[PDB]
Paper text:
Kinesin-1 (also known as conventional kinesin) is an essential ATP-driven molecular motor of the kinesin superfamily capable of processive movement as stepping dimers toward the (+)-end of polarized microtubules (MTs). Kif5 contains a N-terminal motor domain (also known as the head) that generates force and processive stepping via Mg2+-dependent ATP hydrolysis and exchange, multiple coiled-coil (CC) regions with breaks (stalk) that mediate dimerization, and an unstructured C-terminus (tail) involved in autoinhibition. To limit wasteful ATP hydrolysis and futile runs, cargo-less Kif5 adopts a compacted autoinhibited conformation that involves an interaction between the motor domain and the unstructured C-terminal tail centered on its IAK (isoleucine-alanine-lysine) SLiM31 (hereafter just IAK motif). Using engineered stalkless chimeric constructs of human Kif5, we present here MT-bound cryo-EM structures that explain key aspects of kinesin-1’s mechanochemical cycle and autoinhibition.
To explore this using cryo-EM, we designed a stalkless ‘bonsai’ kinesin-1 chimera, dubbed Kif5bMoNeIAK (Motor-Neck-IAK motif), which fuses the N-terminus of human Kif5b (motor domain up to the end of CC1) to its C-terminal IAK motif via a flexible linker. Irrespective of the nucleotide state, they were present either in a two-headed state with motors zipped by the autoinhibitory tail or in a one-headed state with some tail density still visible associated with the MT-bound motor. Whilst for ADP-Kif5bMoNeIAK only the IAK tripeptide (KPI in the opposite direction) could be modeled, for AMPPNP-Kif5bMoNeIAK the ordered region is longer (AQIAKP or AKPIRP). To assess the structural impact of the tail on the ADP-bound conformation, we superimposed the one-headed ADP-bound Kif5bMoNeIAK model onto ADP-bound Kif5bMoNeXXX. The models are almost identical in all regions (RMSD = 0.3 Å), demonstrating that tail association has little effect on the ADP-bound structure of the MT-bound head. Despite the presence of the tail, the MT-bound head of Kif5bMoNeIAK adopts the same apo-like ADP-bound and Mg2+-less conformation seen in Kif5bMoNeXXX, with an extended helix α4 and ordered loop 11 in the MT-binding subdomain and an unfurled partially disordered loop 9. Furthermore, the bonding network between loop 9’s R190, β7’s D231 and helix α2a’s K91 described for Kif5bMoNeXXX is also present in the MT-associated head of one- and two-headed states of Kif5bMoNeIAK. In contrast, in the presence of ADP, the MT-associated head of Kif5bMoNeIAK clearly exhibited a disordered (and undocked) neck linker and shortened helix α6 in both single- and two-headed states. As the two-headed class had lower occupancy in the presence of ADP compared to AMPPNP, it is likely that the stabilization of a docked neck linker and CC1 supports a two-headed complex including a more ordered tail.
Author numbering:
A (entry chain A): 1 to 37, 47 to 437
B (entry chain K): 8 to 194, 199 to 323
C (entry chain B): 1 to 44, 47 to 360, 369 to 436
The structure:
């Protein structure tokens, strides 16, 4: 069988998981109490009396959001030992989430992960949701990833992270945490997907015609992306592609594994009509520079490999026609050493509409995952922010006050510079 | 001005059989490169350098300035089994392998033996350590929570610290031994606390009726420890946190002094507060960092080199 | 689960704390008798932060009141909310401080600090996981300044890894009631700059000006000032007891707001603030709150933010609101006023949003600022201290309790060094 394990660490990860599990329960027809009135074994497991239990682990060092989960509308779904909670939060400190407070619940979460893995026959990989910038999402994720790499090793690990925006920001010590966690994520992960809140805000403003978006809409969009990725494992259709095929068609070199995602068509109910929304139109809209979920225009770079994941009513002839039209264009530039850089996947299961949502019931949707050389601009901006704040050594005494030396910052900066250099040199 | 000196030690017999290899590469006499990354300093010593060269090139001018009524300060930072004790104390009587402190007392005493008869000298010695940000007295175990104040000339000092006179190098060595016999040492001989040693020399001309006071400071900096790679619990974790914070504060103070900033954060930690008189202005200070070139100790060597480079 | 121990020292501290406890009890829905008469589960969900359980559904505050005179104690005990405190938590002497820092800190406070520390220790051992300590006092008085400083030193010795935040009322230039205020203020700052994690500076002149201009009050009294201070105190720590989209702890605020260890002096704020008969003509949205918060006539410290630049600004929103609006407002505030913010720190503003507004409001926001304009306050205090110290005026009272001039000299040097630190980044 084909199963995956989901880990949500930090507040952002927990809320993304709330949205994702609501979406999964809606898709597979499972009520919040776990009773449904074989396409579900991927994310759930039976108990012998009709109850279905998710394969998820919720971890946070602060008891606030998890307590909201335990008393919410999905209180009867999760196993009470999966929701794990500490005493005091990381307070936006990498060291506190790494060691000082980390070595109090790490054994518990490792035991829970072992218990979930011992009950699954054909494990496919892990799905980690966290946010860069926070103490927990940058420090506790590193420790857990290191332990999993030591223990399991050969199993794939996919990450879905929130990257700091160019201008919009929330904390003041975000660059430090982001630099440390992106130093950690190059050694242990396998395919890291990054998004930022500003691009999704702009997408909601222009496409969805909503002027005051909140976190719920962003979480719903990310959940739709993840569901589109996992639909191939869950359902059936022509040209199905699983995780290992994704990685062997998307990652040319070992360290070039940082794609950026895009979804289409994100349309409202008022614009659901009055529009054709054929295969060609949806495919073309995905290459626009204003629909990317990362603040970086693809025009200032070259693509390497892109995988198209159609779902709904799609015929391969239309896909080939759209691919030819995309290839004949000039503003979209591929590298010379990749004569064929398209991976096509189709599924028969149309997207599902959540009640009280901003999306419309469409007959077909696409999800393109491509890794271009235009992803280094965000890293350059964040590194410039980091060095500007680190020249004066501000907010440093908080980090060294938890047993963390001063060499880690320089080492992580060197690693990020090396990664940017690798991307630039492979682009040419 | 601030001077940084780096010393390297040879591969001993107890570790040569394991097949370790050198990592350090030398260019000229002021650059040492590890993994194709330069680290420029004021002077880099090699394995063959004896103790006499180190003393003549690192501490002689500071000793000379003290005897004329100025102030000096010598630090010492390194990891365990990196050469710290060999370059600081060593064998206490060998005329070739003795450390820096025996040569310091020898030079400071050979001048008192040769300066006329109309000058009167006194020697004062103090020995206090910093542990968990609380000053203790190594020469009097009764005192445990001493404090720091300022006199009229806003020149800081330590209140209540034991101060005894000496008359010969034997007395200085004996009080050094007695003080060291009470310092905090973990389970091979790793120090868990910073140590400060003061040698006060004051002179009064009987004829000219002019008074000159001079202070020499010897500081043994404890080693920074990366907690994530060890597994510290309880008291060890607190000691590591305090050591790291104090070293970071000292580095910040030295960097601010070197860069010529208008404001120098002298009041961020106890150690920089005490040495406020003998750090800036017309004061000469030198820092000696001891490193190990074996591949088994690359990470700690890099950390020590980075701490040295932070000063600049 | 992240409990807070509350200590009130002196008359001003006691009255501010009484108003604060009335406000908190109203927010959580607790009758003066100590019972629960609320209407929501979120009120009782996190009640252990400020209250202790008792037999038969009763809640007692974790508050300790200390004074050297029995007047404020039985003035508080006769108030509307005097039946709520534990009678064993009252600790007092008989001989007053007499507006003498030396007396309260050396002679009569040393004969009472043991009992206060005993009750503090007893209160702090019933907590599952401590978070920090709260102190309310006034720097210009005798018992408040000295007693609070001594308690702070003792607690920082006993508990060295806990948050310590104090809400200290600062002497004002054009409003004064004591002739020896600068001495007390300097001797208190000399210790607050060392033994505190984050202190909030408040003065009566700014509160009077707010009441006169913004609220259009005719005859303000001390009740309104205490009420404003209590409102900002309650708004500081709203994320420790209510859910929200973004949660910020006290240690989170300390990490984000304090670049270097000494610079931990803040000027609080609040919004919205309007007058009766003028609320129907104003729309309440995020832009209005943002505009009001960053106004020079809304801070509770008698300093002009225009004569300086901010280092870090923390804005805690309460209510239902969009995150994009908050982010865009906090970005365009810095973009429009780039000359009022430090250039080498990107994103000077931190946003925390909670979804439980205060009763009777749709939206509320608290403002915490760390600006270099706070230097002029210490400048005035040091100038007055120098004026009164050359002639040794009113000095034999302090030296008559066991002090020395060296304490005054060291305190002045420390305050001057703090002023030099704040000016450097301008
Ligand atoms: C019809 C209506 O909306 O009336 C408002 C009101 O008119 C105004 C003017 C209120 C009013 O406040 C004052 O006039 C005031 C008096 C003394 C000190 C400070 C303020 C109000 O009294 C105060 C009251 O505040 C609350 O209810 C909050 O929960 C507040 N509560 C208390 O301070 C409190 C008072 C008495 C007993 C127990 C609690 C609070 C604020 C922060 C944290 C916790 C609680 C409100 C909204 C109003 C009135 C009633 C007129 C204002 O104050 C507050 C704190 O909201 C003054 O400027 C604001 C803007 C409000 O719109
Ligand atoms: N999409 C989304 N992003 C969020 C959400 N909450 C916070 N973020 C982002 O996450 C970053 C802040 O990190 P958090 O996840 O809140 O912090 P944390 O991981 O809980 O760590 P601590 O609270 O410090 O222990 C900022 O960039 C926020 O914009 C959310 O609910 N949804
Ligand atoms: N807000 C407020 N301030 C007060 C109150 N009582 C005194 N003050 C101020 O506190 C300072 C005097 O100190 P005080 O507390 O009375 O002296 P103490 O009793 O010895 O601590 C002056 O600046 C007063 O304006 C009060 O009830 N409320
Ligand atoms: N520069 C050097 N040249 C030769 N031998 C050295 C040198 N530095 C140290 N050693 C050798 O190292 C041994 C122990 O080093 P030590 O000073 O005890 O380090 P630590 O005190 O940190 O344990 C000594 O026996 C000494 O012979
Ligand atoms: Mg959190």
């Amino acid at each position: 069988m084909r199963e995956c394990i989901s880990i949500h660490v930090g507040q952002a990860g927990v809320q993304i998981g709330n949205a994702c599990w609501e979406l999964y329960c809606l898709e597979h027809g499972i009520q919040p109490d776990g009773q449904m009135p074989d396409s579900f074994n991927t994310f759930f497991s039976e108990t012998g009396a009709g109850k279905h239990v998710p394969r998820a682990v919720f971890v946070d060092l602060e008891p606030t959001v998890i307590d909201e989960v335990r008393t919410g509308t999905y209180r009867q779904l999760f196993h009470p030992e999966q929701l794990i909670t500490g005493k005091e939060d990381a307070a936006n400190n990498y060291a506190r989430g790494h060691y000082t407070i980390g070595k109090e619940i790490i054994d518990l979460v490792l035991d829970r992960i072992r218990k979930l893995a011992d009950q699954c026959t054909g494990l496919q990989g892990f799905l980690v949701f966290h946010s860069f910038g926070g103490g927990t999402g940058s420090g506790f994720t590193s420790l857990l990833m290191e332990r999993l790499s030591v223990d399991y090793g050969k199993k794939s690990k996919l990450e879905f992270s929130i990257y700091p925006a160019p201008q919009v920001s929330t904390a003041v010590v975000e660059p430090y945490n982001s630099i440390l966690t992106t130093h950690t994520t190059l050694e242990h992960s396998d395919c890291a997907f990054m998004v930022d809140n500003e691009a999704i805000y702009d997408i909601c403003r222009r496409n969805l015609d909503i002027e005051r978006p909140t976190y719920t809409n962003l979480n719903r969009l990310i959940s739709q992306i993840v569901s589109s990725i996992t639909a191939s494992l869950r359902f059936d259709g022509a040209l199905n592609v699983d995780l290992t095929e994704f990685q062997t068609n998307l990652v040319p070199y070992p360290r070039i594994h940082f794609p950026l995602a895009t979804y289409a068509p994100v349309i409202s109910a008022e614009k659901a009509y009055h529009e054709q929304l054929s295969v060609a139109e949806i495919t073309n809209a995905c290459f626009e520079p204003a629909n990317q979920m990362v603040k970086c225009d693809p025009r200032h770079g070259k693509y390497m490999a892109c995988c198209l994941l159609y779902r709904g009513d799609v015929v391969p002839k239309d896909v080939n026609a759209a691919i030819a039209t995309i290839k004949t264009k000039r503003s979209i530039q591929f590298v010379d050493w990749c004569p064929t850089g398209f991976k096509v996947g189709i599924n028969y299961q149309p997207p599902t509409v959540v009640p009280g949502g901003d999306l419309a019931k469409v007959q077909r949707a696409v999800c393109m995952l491509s890794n271009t050389t235009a992803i280094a601009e965000a890293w350059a901006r964040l590194d410039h922010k980091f060095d500007l704040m680190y020249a004066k050594r501000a907010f440093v005494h908080w980090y060294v006050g938890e047993g963390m030396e001063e060499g880690e910052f320089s080492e992580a900066r060197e690693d990020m510079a090396a990664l940017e250099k690798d991307y630039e040199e492979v682009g040419v | 001005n601030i001077k940084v000196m780096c010393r390297f030690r040879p591969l001993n017999e107890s570790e040569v059989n394991r097949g370790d290899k050198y990592i350090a590469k030398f260019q000229g006499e002021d650059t040492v490169v590890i993994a194709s990354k330069p680290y420029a300093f004021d002077r880099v010593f090699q394995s063959s350098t004896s103790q006499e060269q180190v003393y003549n090139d690192c501490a002689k001018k500071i000793v000379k300035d003290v005897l004329e009524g100025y102030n000096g300060t010598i630090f010492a930072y390194g990891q365990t089994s990196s050469g710290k004790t060999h370059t600081m104390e060593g064998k206490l009587h060998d005329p070739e392998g003795m450390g820096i402190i025996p040569r310091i007392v020898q030079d400071i005493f050979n001048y008192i033996y040769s300066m006329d008869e109309n000058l009167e000298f006194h020697i004062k010695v103090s020995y206090f350590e910093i542990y968990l940000d609380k000053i203790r007295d190594l020469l009097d175990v009764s005192k445990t929570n001493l404090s720091v104040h300022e006199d009229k000339n806003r020149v800081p000092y330590v209140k209540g610290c034991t101060e005894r006179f000496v008359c010969s190098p034997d007395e200085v060595m004996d009080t050094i031994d007695e003080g060291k016999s009470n310092r905090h040492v973990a389970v091979e001989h790793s120090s868990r606390s910073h140590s400060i040693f003061l040698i006060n020399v004051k002179q009064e001309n009987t004829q000219t009726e002019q008074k000159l006071s001079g202070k020499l400071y010897l500081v043994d900096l404890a080693g920074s420890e990366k907690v994530s790679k060890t597994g510290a619990e309880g008291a060890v974790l607190d000691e590591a946190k305090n050591i790291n914070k104090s070293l970071s504060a000292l580095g910040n103070v030295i960097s601010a002094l070197a860069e010529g900033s208008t404001y120098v954060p002298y009041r961020d930690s106890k150690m920089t507060r005490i040495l406020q008189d003998s750090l800036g202005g017309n004061c000469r200070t030198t820092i000696v960092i001891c490193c190990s070139p074996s591949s088994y100790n690359e990470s700690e060597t890099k950390s020590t080199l980075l701490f040295g480079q932070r000063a600049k | 689960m992240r409990e807070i121990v509350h200590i009130q020292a002196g008359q001003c501290g006691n009255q501010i704390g009484a108003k604060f406890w009335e406000v908190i009890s109203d927010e959580h829905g607790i009758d003066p008798t100590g019972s629960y008469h609320g209407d929501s589960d979120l009120q009782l969900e996190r009640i252990n932060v400020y209250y202790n359980e008792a037999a038969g559904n009763k809640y007692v505050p974790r508050a300790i009141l200390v004074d050297l005179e029995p007047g404020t104690m039985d003035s508080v005990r006769s108030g509307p909310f005097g039946q709520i405190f534990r009678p064993d938590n009252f600790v007092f002497g008989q001989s007053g401080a007499g507006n003498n820092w030396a007396k309260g800190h050396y002679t009569e406070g040393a004969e009472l600090v043991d009992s206060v520390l005993d009750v503090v220790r007893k209160e702090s051992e019933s907590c599952d996981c401590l978070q920090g300590f709260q102190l309310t006092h006034s720097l210009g008085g005798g018992t408040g300044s000295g007693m609070g400083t001594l308690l702070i030193s003792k607690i920082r010795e006993e508990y060295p890894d806990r948050i310590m935040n104090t809400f200290s009322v600062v002497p004002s230039p054009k409003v004064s009631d004591t002739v020896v205020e600068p001495y007390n203020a300097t001797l208190s700052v000399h210790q607050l700059v060392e033994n505190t994690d984050e202190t909030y500076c408040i003065d009566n002149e700014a509160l009077y000006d707010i009441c006169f201009r913004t609220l259009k009050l005719t005859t303000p009294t001390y009740g309104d000032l205490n009420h404003l201070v209590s409102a900002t105190m309650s708004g500081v720590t709203t994320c420790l007891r209510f859910p929200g989209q973004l949660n910020a702890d006290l240690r989170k605020l300390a990490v984000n707001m304090v670049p270097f260890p000494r610079l931990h002096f803040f000027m609080p704020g609040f919004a919205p603030l309007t007058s009766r008969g003028s609320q129907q003509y104003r729309a309440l949205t995020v832009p209005e709150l943002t505009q009001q918060m960053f106004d020079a006539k809304n801070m509770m410290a008698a300093c002009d933010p225009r004569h300086g630049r901010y280092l870090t600004v923390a804005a805690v929103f309460r209510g239902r609101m969009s995150m994009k609006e908050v982010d865009e407002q906090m970005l365009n505030v810095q973009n429009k006023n780039s000359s009022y913010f430090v250039e080498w720190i990107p994103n000077n503003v931190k946003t925390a949003v909670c979804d439980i507004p205060p009763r009777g409001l749709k939206m509320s926001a608290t403002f915490i600022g760390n600006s270099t304009a706070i230097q002029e306050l210490f400048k005035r205090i040091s100038e007055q201290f120098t004026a009164m110290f050359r002639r040794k005026a009113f000095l034999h009272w302090y030296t008559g309790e066991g002090m020395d001039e060296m304490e005054f000299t060291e305190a002045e040097s420390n305050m001057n060094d703090l002023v030099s630190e704040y000016q450097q980044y301008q």
